[PDB]
């Protein structure tokens, strides 16, 4: 996996 | 953003 | 299956 | 707004 | 989850 | 939380 | 179809 | 489990 | 063909 | 992702 | 172990 | 994909 610090999918 | 062929998140 | 929003495990 | 102690979006 | 079509967060 | 014998996600 | 949470086969 | 003739997934 | 180890389709 | 012009899996 | 982001078996 | 000789997951 995750990136973005929103968790999986979204911001990668 | 998206990887996998299966949509946002999931495999990447 | 998913629940929460959250993808597969995590919050339910 | 938001829900879910975690912010906007993710868990409701 | 996602309300507003606007993704998750943002509109509610 | 977990159900299914197999952890967090997979089967509930 | 799919049944398990897993995808095609392995668990119903 | 199986079902179809065809094995683990594929037709139920 | 299939990859991905899921099946035709989905992941390649 | 696709190939073939058939969408997701059948011919690659 | 896991491989894929998806967690125990599924994608490597 | 499957590695362990036990199918999907579990020992690689
Ligand atoms: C090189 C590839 C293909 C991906 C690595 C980065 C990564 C792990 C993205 C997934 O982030 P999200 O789960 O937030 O979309
Ligand atoms: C190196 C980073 C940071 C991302 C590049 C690849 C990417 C855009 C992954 C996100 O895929 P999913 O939406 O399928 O998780
Ligand atoms: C009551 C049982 C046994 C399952 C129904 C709810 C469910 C489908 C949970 C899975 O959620 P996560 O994949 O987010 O853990
Ligand atoms: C009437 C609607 C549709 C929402 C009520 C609760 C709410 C404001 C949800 C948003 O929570 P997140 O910002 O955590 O997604
Ligand atoms: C049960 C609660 C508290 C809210 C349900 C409405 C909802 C699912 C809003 C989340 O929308 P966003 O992801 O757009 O913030
Ligand atoms: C009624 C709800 C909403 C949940 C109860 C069952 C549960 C806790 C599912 C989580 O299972 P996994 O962690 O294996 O996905
Ligand atoms: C009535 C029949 C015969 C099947 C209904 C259940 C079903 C659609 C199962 C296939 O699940 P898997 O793809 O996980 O093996
Ligand atoms: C009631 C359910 C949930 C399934 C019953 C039949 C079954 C065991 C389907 C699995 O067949 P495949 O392995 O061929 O997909
Ligand atoms: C380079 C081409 C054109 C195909 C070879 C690899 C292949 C056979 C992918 C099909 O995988 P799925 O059936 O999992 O989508
Ligand atoms: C690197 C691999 C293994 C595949 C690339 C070509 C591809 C993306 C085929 C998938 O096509 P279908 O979705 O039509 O099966
Ligand atoms: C040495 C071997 C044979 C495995 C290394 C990679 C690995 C740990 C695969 C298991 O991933 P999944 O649980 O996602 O299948
Ligand atoms: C390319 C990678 C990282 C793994 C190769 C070995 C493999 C396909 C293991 C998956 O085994 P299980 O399905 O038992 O987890
Ligand atoms: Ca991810
Ligand atoms: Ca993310
Ligand atoms: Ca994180
Ligand atoms: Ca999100
Ligand atoms: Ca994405
Ligand atoms: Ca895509
Ligand atoms: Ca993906
Ligand atoms: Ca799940
Ligand atoms: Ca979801
Ligand atoms: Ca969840
Ligand atoms: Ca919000
Ligand atoms: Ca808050
Ligand atoms: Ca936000
Ligand atoms: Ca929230
Ligand atoms: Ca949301
Ligand atoms: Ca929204
Ligand atoms: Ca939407
Ligand atoms: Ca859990
Ligand atoms: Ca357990
Ligand atoms: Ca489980
Ligand atoms: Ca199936
Ligand atoms: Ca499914
Ligand atoms: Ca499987
Ligand atoms: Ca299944
Ligand atoms: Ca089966
Ligand atoms: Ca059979
Ligand atoms: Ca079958
Ligand atoms: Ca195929
Ligand atoms: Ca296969
Ligand atoms: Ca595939
Ligand atoms: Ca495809
Ligand atoms: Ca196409
Ligand atoms: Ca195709
Ligand atoms: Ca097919
Ligand atoms: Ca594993
Ligand atoms: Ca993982
Ligand atoms: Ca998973
Ligand atoms: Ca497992
Ligand atoms: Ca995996
Ligand atoms: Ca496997
Ligand atoms: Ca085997
Ligand atoms: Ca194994
Ligand atoms: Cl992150
Ligand atoms: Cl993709
Ligand atoms: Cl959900
Ligand atoms: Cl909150
Ligand atoms: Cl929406
Ligand atoms: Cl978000
Ligand atoms: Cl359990
Ligand atoms: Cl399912
Ligand atoms: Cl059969
Ligand atoms: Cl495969
Ligand atoms: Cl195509
Ligand atoms: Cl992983
Ligand atoms: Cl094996
Ligand atoms: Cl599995
Ligand atoms: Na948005």
């Given at each position: 996996x995750n990136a973005x610090?929103?968790?999986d999918?979204?911001?990668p």
């Open positions: 610090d929103d968790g999918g979204a911001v």
